[PDB]
Amino acid sequence: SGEYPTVNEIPVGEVRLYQIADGVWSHIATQSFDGAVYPSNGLIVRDGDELLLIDTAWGAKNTAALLAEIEKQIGLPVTRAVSTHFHDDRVGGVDVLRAAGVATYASPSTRRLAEAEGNEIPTHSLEGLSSSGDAVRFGPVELFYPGAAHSTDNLVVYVPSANVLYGGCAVHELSSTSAGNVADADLAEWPTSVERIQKHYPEAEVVIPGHGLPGGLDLLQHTANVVKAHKN
Ligand SMILES: CC(C)c1cccc2c(-c3ccc(C[S@@](C)(N)O)c(F)c3)c(C(=O)O)[nH]c12
Ligand SMILES: [Zn+2]
Ligand SMILES: [Zn+2]
């Protein structure tokens, strides 16, 4: 009822949306992995009379539920989606999106990693993002490659109209003490990549992590701290 959704408020198999700013929502869904249940976020950005989706809802049925929730709550068509790295919480559901007519996009690095992992593969390659510090425009957002962090391919997304920074899985929520699933991370480079984010987007007003609650700029330094505590 207005608080940021968690697993305890999302009915089984459903998705919730949360209004972040004018024309900006996050989407929240729950999934089980290796016997534990996790929340995950994505983003929705209004693009005139269409919508841009960032990240799937972590699985085929969750992503179908996401599309239905969007139609119920917003009622504008999702025409494009970007996945911000190759893990299932970002691409699992891309087949559902594609079959619904959504054009799906990711960097070439994410596409290669997804294919090699056996994960669903976005259709279209996003060039211009292969070097740390690169940025490109995509509809109403900027896509930025900060360098290796949670994964070597992770992208962040900035919504300039609202000063919303969607960090994806390179950014952790404030309540975290641990650094999440680091199987594919570069813990040594992650703080440098976070520093690049901080330098590029110093006016961000909302920071959204890939899992957990949004907050402010503090999420960036906090993420560096938790990653360093893990590495130690
Ligand atoms: C490879 C993908 C599909 C995957 C599977 C299972 C879990 C994760 C996580 C993850 C794990 C723990 C926390 C809470 S803590 C931060 N306190 O450690 C968490 F927030 C996330 C992440 C992630 O970190 O993105 N990915 C996961
Ligand atoms: Zn991941
Ligand atoms: Zn993640």
From TrEMBL:
Zn(2+) 2 binds at D89, C169. One of its GO terms (molecular function) is beta-lactamase activity. Keywords: Antibiotic resistance, Hydrolase, Metal-binding, Periplasm, Plasmid, Signal, Zinc. Its EC number is 3.5.2.6. It is found in: Periplasm. It catalyses: a beta-lactam + H2O = a substituted beta-amino acid. One of its GO terms (biological process) is antibiotic catabolic process. Belongs to the metallo-beta-lactamase superfamily. Class-B beta-lactamase family. Monomer. Class B beta-lactamase which confers resistance to the beta-lactam antibiotics, including penicillins, cephalosporins and carbapenems. Acts via hydrolysis of the beta-lactam ring. Has penicillin-, cephalosporin- and carbapenem-hydrolyzing activities. This is beta-lactamase.
